[PDB]
Write a sequence for this structure.
């Protein structure tokens, strides 16, 4: 009939179709410092524990 | 290139920073609602145009709509329909044999859209798996039983596409 | 080199298996297609039987040259591979 | 002294039940990750599925492939089952809850792990399929190449403890867990255990009980390597480092929790990443892990010696 | 029969329960019905949830779903694969092509039904059958398995 | 390698016939090993079978038809050399093998 | 670039003895050549600067049992540079060997094998001309008009023989041919 | 079956439930079969089959009339 | 060197794949694919059917891209009939062809990733595949084999909510593609298993008859929707992605970009779709309305003749090709003036792609042959008819 399937008046909403970036990270600089500090402090604590065990 | 860039891309090579980004996505999908359905209890959505099990309809007075015109048999691309007809005692044009090979049927709906009296339709039923081959050789009695069993749903669907067909 | 006796026996024995070749006519000098009235298919079948009783091979240019059993038995006696 | 078989049964049968439920847990966790549900019809939440699987593989009326010596083929799964279960006699679950307290436990574990190569090799040759033979040879080479790095990481851990007793390695982490300082070592050990078990991106690959025993041995190896990962780096049965008010929880629960965490990491890693190629497995395992493990051994030994922090 | 009618019944029920709860089909994907089988095992319908997991080799599979057009050149391989599965085995025919030739029934290079090569236990009609139609077919196969009385018949002979 | 160009006379057709027959003869030992035909058939019964086929197709005088026949025979030989065909197929094709014909046909069926 | 330009250019540039029939229409510019000039024509149309046809789309046969030269072999060609399509056709019967074009277009091997399998047309200098689609040991060429739709043989499993066997065809329901042709066409 | 509304009851005793969805749907039209003996996997009459499969919005009690 | 056989009967790799590999060591020296296991005689069966009766055969050729083959067959019939199609029908056909392209690209990408070993993206993609098969199941009555596109116009009109639901789908398909891309594109294992694998030069692609993603990965900017546009494709804005190295990674990136552009085209088709009738007004070639056949004599006569004899195509022959998701899908239709096609060759892109497997895989590892096979997006329904 006169009522036919189609877009509503004014058209549909605009939609994104391109890739969205995602900058989710702890960073290159931060991770190295965190791991190195963990290594140093952990080795110090391991030495303390070894002293107590001795 | 830059020492900063070399350091940045060497850290990402060693710290597996492009795999943590995939682990995070998989984990985020771990804590999420599932989209699986309990098939025996809840069924997937369908459409009124769905082409399932065939059914032969009859008039509300109790007379079968099929007039043995063989117009569905000539359009069937799979040659799955065989019709035998003769003049009934009242002189009406009716079928004596109307059998459909469900093992040849391709469920295209050409027979449904070629019937001039809406006698043969494809109902919403899709759960009719059989344990034997010749139980899939539907005949006139089986098709009429299908039509009587699915009459209300078939009528509602045909009412729905009255605006489209 | 090989002695004439064994090669003559080996060429006189296998030729009697064609269900038409006369045993009385086969001899060290008896042409296949001419003296025995054979067919060209039999003319190549005799050569094939020569390489059916041994593993050596006859090139396609060494089969249609001379259809004589005397030259055939001479060539067989000059076959180092056989014994 | 007749109660030792009771202890062996009590450590063996729950291990098999845990292996079956680990297979179920893997098939459930992958389903949850991929936006579906695992087996749920059989049990209340699928908990009865492994029993149904067991009765199925038992009741199959199968035929023995006697197209071989029939001895090595039949005993290769038995041998790998031997090796997979025998390593659990030394792993401690709490302070005094170890079946066999060896003083050479780390080396005994290394020996048991190195002797696991024969089962797959014998199964590969005994099967007359040449292609299965080549696949078994490749798997054996991979297990070997990563067992080297596993041994080097064991050296890294052993330097900081000073004893091969497994129950003392845990007690050496009372101050802090070894996973905090040696975090790259922990990551390398986990990846090597992934490659050792023929699992994760490192997983390149007959019927009835032979394949059943191989499957059970592989999953028992997975559980054992998760236990080793939590035993050397996560403090074993020791509680959380801070907030010591929950001490009412038995130490055996913490070991179980950490093992379950590592098993979840196995399932997660296998679900999240694609497969490696053989020409890349060997290159990676011989060029990225051997040098790194050797360098970490050198660095840890040099740092401990320099400041006299040795055991 | 004071306990045989009871104990044999219970052990046979246990056997049937195990076999229905753990079915390992071997999907024999041949044509567009393979897409429907992949959709059935995906997240929406979750064929795994009933215990069904597909297998690559016939050594470890107790069911075999033939879903696609069976050609003359492929039938020997079909039969060879079927002959390699262990004894308690079932065959499910999926789609019109596997049932009776389907839309290529009158072709010169099509086997008019997989039941001419292997014995079929369940026929699933459609072209292609709906994924829920395949679920119904597997449920019907389960219902048929529960009808088996292996231990009672063994006792009665 | 490539399909040979079409022949121009009957002599070339005969030469190709002989070449194909020799190729089939050299192919006999390979079939005896690929298929367990050792204790099945003599190494000359097959040779006679190919000879009989060539002889009963020997009334052709068209070189193109002879070339097509040779090509089809070579295709069949190549298929048999490979494991493509089943074992009983060659044994079903390559084996050498009272009132009146009319009355037996009459007793059988009306359609002769 | 277009059918109006390619037609005139090939009318002028091409040697006259090659092409014997030229249609210029919207359905497609066709060339009909003798089977002994096909390779030369396609080599010319593959190398010439203004007719750079570098893609052979497909090779198909058409069966005309009423003609003396029964089979029609069609070469659909595409020129990516000039965005144009050219169709070249030849005619051959059941016992003549036409030249192969695998030398010019390497992809022609499989379509030539398919044409030989479906129609029985043999190609000279084809590296390996064997059936590609039909079953092993298939006898007859199905795409011919005289070949029955259901074929001559049928396949079933023989339990005593313990293998899948081939038997003469026997339909449980024959193909029903419906004659819808009208006398007022 | 918790936080759900019972749409209607069938002649076989089957109960039909419905829940309201917002953006992703899930467990919004299902049946609690009145039987437990394997439930035959197909016991929904024609008047309720359309409602279950989202073919029609009529419940099935309204489809009868 | 020895002779190897990969016949995977399980559809974890196609299903009817038969490769006879000659391997020297771990490398493969030649790959000879044995086809014919799915040759069902489709080409010969077409000659025995009416033009209407032969339409469903094209659904089952490339059964991952159903609407693409129907579009080509319908366009060939219209070309041989000179039948004009209304604008709304053209927009519907373009919309559903792009939906089909998205479906095919999703299935290809994730079935290829599953062969490599990435199990997760497969189910994530089949969720969206189910969502789009819902749209097919709505307009037609079949989820997969929808005989919707027909030579005259389209089979029947759209339901009420289809446009709204497709818009809702397009609102999130971009994020779905983004997640799938995040799983695979940045991963180092995925790069290592595709980069420099299956390299093909542009000259090789042209010589071997490559088309679609296979051809465009080598740098050749050849799209049939822009070189020989059909329907309303010249009124829509979309880019054509082109590769730079020709390896399997460029193929994957182009397959992502093509699916994004198909989303863009779908949005444009939804926004610009006009109103009007969906079939040609020449009822001598299209069925009458069900209300008109039961009320008018000539409409009933047309219905009877169409559904027994069908239309008769004037004697001619032509080749029409469309841009199928796999590549260039062509139909060579020959008509003798009757109601049945005289000859109908189906030019399948997968034929020319599986023919070229021999040279792409030469001197490659055995584990790279599965990636080379999966990057071509081959289904055997079309390879052997
Ligand atoms: C790859 O395909 C396969 C699977 O699917 C993934 C399997 O699940 C499986 C195996 C799954 C199983 C559930 C088999 C495991 C069964 C067992 C370990 C039997 C254990 C039984 C016992 C220990 C006796 C019970 C003891 C107690 C209750 C004492 C409690 C303390 C195999 C072999 C397979 O090949
Ligand atoms: C509480 C529990 C916490 C979690 C515990 C478990 C941790 C693991 C969790 C899962 C992590 C992801 C697992 C993915 C498994 C497969 C990953 C293998 C990939 C890989 O091997 O990367 C290689 C290089 O990176 C590598 O080398 C990787 C190893 C690097 C180890 C870290 C070394 C850093 C040293 C820094 C020292 C600084 C501190 C001391 C001063 C190849 O990569 P490629 O392809 O580029 O080939 C290099 C050519 N050149
Ligand atoms: C296991 C092996 C598989 C393959 C086995 C072979 C299967 C196919 C067999 C070939 C079928 C054919 O018809 S292929 C061979 C058909 N070609 C001819 O028959 C040529 C006409 N014959 C003649 O000219 C003469 O009679 C001649 C016989 C040459 C000699 O006689 P002369 O020289 O005196 O003239
Ligand atoms: S649905 Fe199609 S194939 Fe089935 S009977 Fe009707 S016309 Fe024939
Ligand atoms: S079902 Fe319809 S089309 Fe078929 S014979 Fe009966 S009235 Fe005619
Ligand atoms: S039954 Fe239909 S969908 Fe299934 S394989 Fe045959 S033609 Fe394809």
């Amino acid at each position: 009939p006169l009522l036919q399937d189609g877009p509503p008046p004014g058209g549909f909403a605009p939609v994104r179709y391109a890739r969205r970036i995602s900058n989710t990270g702890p960073s290159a600089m931060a991770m190295f410092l965190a791991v190195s500090g963990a290594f140093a402090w952990g080795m110090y604590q391991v030495g303390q524990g070894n002293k107590i065990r001795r | 290139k830059d020492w900063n860039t070399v350091f940045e891309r060497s850290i990402n090579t060693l710290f597996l920073t492009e795999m943590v980004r995939g682990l995070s996505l998989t984990l985020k999908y771990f804590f999420d609602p599932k989209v699986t359905i309990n098939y025996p209890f809840e069924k997937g959505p369908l459409s009124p145009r769905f082409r399932g099990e065939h059914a032969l309809r009859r008039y509300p007075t109790g007379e079968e709509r099929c007039i043995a015109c063989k117009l569905c048999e000539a359009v069937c691309p799979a040659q799955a329909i065989t019709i035998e007809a003769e003049e009934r005692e009242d002189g009406s044009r009716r079928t004596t044999r109307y059998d459909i090979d469900m093992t040849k049927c391709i469920y295209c709906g050409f027979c449904q859209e070629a019937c001039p009296v809406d006698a043969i339709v494809e109902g919403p039923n899709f759960e009719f798996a059989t344990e034997t081959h010749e139980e899939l050789l539907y005949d006139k009695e089986k098709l009429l039983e299908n039509g009587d069993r699915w009459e209300t749903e078939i009528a509602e669907n045909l009412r729905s596409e009255s605006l489209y067909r | 080199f090989l002695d004439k006796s064994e090669v003559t026996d080996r060429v006189l024995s296998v030729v009697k298996n064609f269900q038409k070749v006369d045993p009385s006519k086969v001899t060290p000098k008896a042409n296949f297609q001419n003296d025995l009235g054979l067919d060209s298919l039999d003319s190549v079948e005799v050569v094939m039987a020569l390489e059916e009783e041994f593993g050596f091979e006859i090139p396609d240019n060494e089969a249609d040259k001379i259809q004589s059993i005397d030259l055939a038995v001479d060539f067989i006696a000059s076959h180092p591979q056989a014994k | 002294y007749i109660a030792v078989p009771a202890e062996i049964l009590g450590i063996i049968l729950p291990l098999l039940l845990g292996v079956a439920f680990l297979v179920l847990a893997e098939r459930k966790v992958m389903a949850f990750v991929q936006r579906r549900k695992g087996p749920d019809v059989v049990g209340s939440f699928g908990l009865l599925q492994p029993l149904a699987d067991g009765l199925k593989l038992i009741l199959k009326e199968p035929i023995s492939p006697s197209s071989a010596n029939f001895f090595l083929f039949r005993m290769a799964p038995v041998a790998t089952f031997m090796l997979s279960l025998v390593a659990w006699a030394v792993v401690p679950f709490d302070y005094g809850m170890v079946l066999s307290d060896l003083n050479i436990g780390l080396l005994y574990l290394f020996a048991i792990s190195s002797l696991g190569v024969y089962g797959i090799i014998i199964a590969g040759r005994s099967s007359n399929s040449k292609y299965a033979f080549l696949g078994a040879l490749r798997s054996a080479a991979q297990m070997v190449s990563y067992e080297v790095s596993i041994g080097l990481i064991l050296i890294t851990v052993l330097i900081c403890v000073g004893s091969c007793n497994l129950s003392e390695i845990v007690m050496a982490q009372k101050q802090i867990w070894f996973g905090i300082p040696l975090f790259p070592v922990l990551v390398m050990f986990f990846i090597s255990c992934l490659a050792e078990t023929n699992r994760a991106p490192f997983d390149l690959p007959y019927s009835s009980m032979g394949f059943a025993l191989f499957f059970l041995g592989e999953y028992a190896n997975m559980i054992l390597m998760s236990g080793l990962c939590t035993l050397f780096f996560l403090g074993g049965w020791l509680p959380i480092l801070d907030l010591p008010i929950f001490k009412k929880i038995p130490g055996s629960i913490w070991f179980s929790i950490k093992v379950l965490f590592f098993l979840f990491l196995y399932i997660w890693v296998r679900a999240a990443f694609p497969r490696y190629r053989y020409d890349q497995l060997m290159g990676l395992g011989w060029k990225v892990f051997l040098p790194l493990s050797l360098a970490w051994v050198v660095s840890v030994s040099g740092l401990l010696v320099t400041f006299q922090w040795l055991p | 029969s004071k306990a045989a009618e009871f104990v044999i019944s219970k052990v046979d029920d246990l056997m049937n329960w195990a076999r229905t709860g753990s079915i390992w089909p071997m999907t024999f994907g041949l044509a567009c019905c393979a897409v429907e089988m992949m959709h059935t095992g995906a997240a929406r319908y979750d064929l795994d949830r009933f215990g069904i997991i597909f297998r690559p080799s016939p050594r470890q599979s107790d069911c075999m779903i033939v879903a696609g057009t069976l050609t003359n050149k492929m039938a020997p391989a079909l039969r060879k694969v079927y002959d390699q599965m262990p004894e308690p085995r079932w065959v499910i025919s999926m789609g019109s092509c596997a049932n009776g030739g389907g839309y290529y029934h009158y072709s010169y290079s099509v086997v008019r039904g997989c039941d001419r090569i292997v014995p079929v236990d369940i026929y699933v009609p459609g072209c292609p059958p709906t994924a829920e139609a395949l679920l119904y077919g597997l449920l019907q196969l389960q219902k048929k398995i529960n009808r088996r009385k292996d231990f009672l018949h063994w006792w009665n002979k | 390698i490539g399909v040979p160009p079409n022949s121009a006379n009957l002599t070339e057709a005969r030469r190709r016939v002989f070449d194909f027959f020799r190729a089939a003869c050299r192919s006999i030992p390979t079939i005896m090993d690929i298929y367990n035909l050792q204790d099945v058939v003599a190494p000359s019964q097959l040779r006679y079978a190919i000879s009989a086929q060539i002889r009963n197709n020997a009334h052709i005088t068209d070189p193109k038809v002879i070339d097509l026949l040779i090509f089809k025979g070579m295709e069949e030989l190549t298929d048999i050399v490979d494991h493509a065909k089943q074992r009983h197929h060659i044994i079903g094709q390559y084996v050498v093998g009272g009132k009146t014909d009319f009355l037996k046909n009459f007793y059988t069926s009306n359609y002769f | 670039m277009d059918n109006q330009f390619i037609f005139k250019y090939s009318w002028e540039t091409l040697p006259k003895k090659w092409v014997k029939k030229m249609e210029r229409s919207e359905h497609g510019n066709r060339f009909d050549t003798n089977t002994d000039y096909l390779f030369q024509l396609l080599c010319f149309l593959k190398l010439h600067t203004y007719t750079r046809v570098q893609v052979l789309i497909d090779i198909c046969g058409v069966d005309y049992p009423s003609r003396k030269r029964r089979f029609e072999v069609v070469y659909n060609l595409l020129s990516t540079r000039y965005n144009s399509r050219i169709r070249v056709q030849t005619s051959a019967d059941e016992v003549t060997r036409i030249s192969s074009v695998v030398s010019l277009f390497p992809s022609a091997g499989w379509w030539e094998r398919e044409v030989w399998d479906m129609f029985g047309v043999s190609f000279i200098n084809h590296p390996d001309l064997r059936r590609i689609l039909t079953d092993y040991g298939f006898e007859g060429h199905p795409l011919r008009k005289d070949f029955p739709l259901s074929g001559y043989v049928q396949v079933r499993y023989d339990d005593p023989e313990k293998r899948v066997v081939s038997e003469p065809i026997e339909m449980t329901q024959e193909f029903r041919y419906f004659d819808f042709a009208s006398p007022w066409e | 079956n918790i936080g759900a509304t019972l749409v209607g009851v069938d002649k076989f005793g089957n109960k039909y439930y419905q829940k309201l969805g917002d953006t992703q749907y899930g467990r919004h039209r299902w049946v609690e079969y009145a039987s437990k003996d394997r439930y035959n996997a197909s016991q929904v009459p024609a008047e309720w089959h359309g409602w279950l499969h989202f073919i029609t919005d009529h419940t099935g009690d309204e489809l009868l009339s | 060197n020895f002779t190897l056989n990969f016949g995977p009967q399980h559809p974890a790799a196609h299903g009817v794949l038969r490769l006879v590999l000659e391997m020297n060591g771990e490398v493969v020296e030649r790959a000879e694919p044995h086809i014919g296991l799915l040759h069902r005689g489709t080409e010969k069966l077409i000659e025995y059917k009416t033009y209407l009766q032969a339409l469903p055969y094209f659904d089952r050729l490339d059964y991952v891209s159903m609407m693409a083959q129907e579009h080509a067959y319908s366009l060939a019939v219209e070309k041989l009939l000179n039948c004009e199609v209304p604008l709304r029908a053209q927009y519907i056909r373009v919309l559903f062809c792009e939906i089909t392209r998205i479906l095919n690209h999703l299935l290809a990408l994730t079935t290829h990733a599953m062969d490599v070993g990435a199990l997760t993206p497969f189910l994530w993609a089949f969720e969206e595949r189910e969502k789009l098969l819902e749209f097919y199941e709505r307009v037609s009555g079949a989820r997969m084999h929808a005989s919707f596109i027909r030579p005259g116009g389209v089979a029947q009109d759209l339901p009420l909510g289809l446009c709204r639901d497709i818009d809702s789908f397009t609102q999130q398909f971009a994020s779905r593609i983004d997640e799938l891309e995040e799983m695979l594109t940045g991963n180092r294992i995925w790069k290592q298993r595709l980069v420099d694998i299956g390299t093909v030069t542009a000259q090789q692609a042209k010589d071997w008859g490559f088309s679609g993603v296979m051809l465009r990965g080598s740098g050749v900017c050849w799209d049939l929707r822009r070189a020989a546009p059909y329907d309303v494709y010249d009124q829509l804005d979309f880019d054509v992605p082109v590769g730079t190295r020709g390896d399997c990674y460029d193929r994957y990136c182009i397959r992502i970009e093509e699916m994004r552009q198909s989303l863009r085209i779908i949005v444009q088709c939804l926004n610009q779709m006009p109103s009007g009738m969906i079939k040609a007004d020449d009822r001598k070639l299209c069925p009458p309305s069900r209300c008109r056949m039961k009320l008018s004599m000539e409409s009933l006569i047309h219905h009877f003749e169409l559904y027994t004899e069908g239309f008769s195509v004037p004697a001619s022959s032509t080749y029409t090709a469309v841009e199928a998701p796999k590549g260039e899908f062509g139909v060579f239709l020959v008509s003798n003036g009757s109601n049945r096609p005289y000859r109908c060759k189906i030019r399948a892109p997968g034929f020319a792609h599986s023919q070229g497997l021999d040279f792409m895989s030469k001197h490659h590892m055995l584990a790279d042959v599965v990636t080379i096979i999966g990057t071509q997006d081959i289904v055997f329904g079309e390879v052997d008819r």
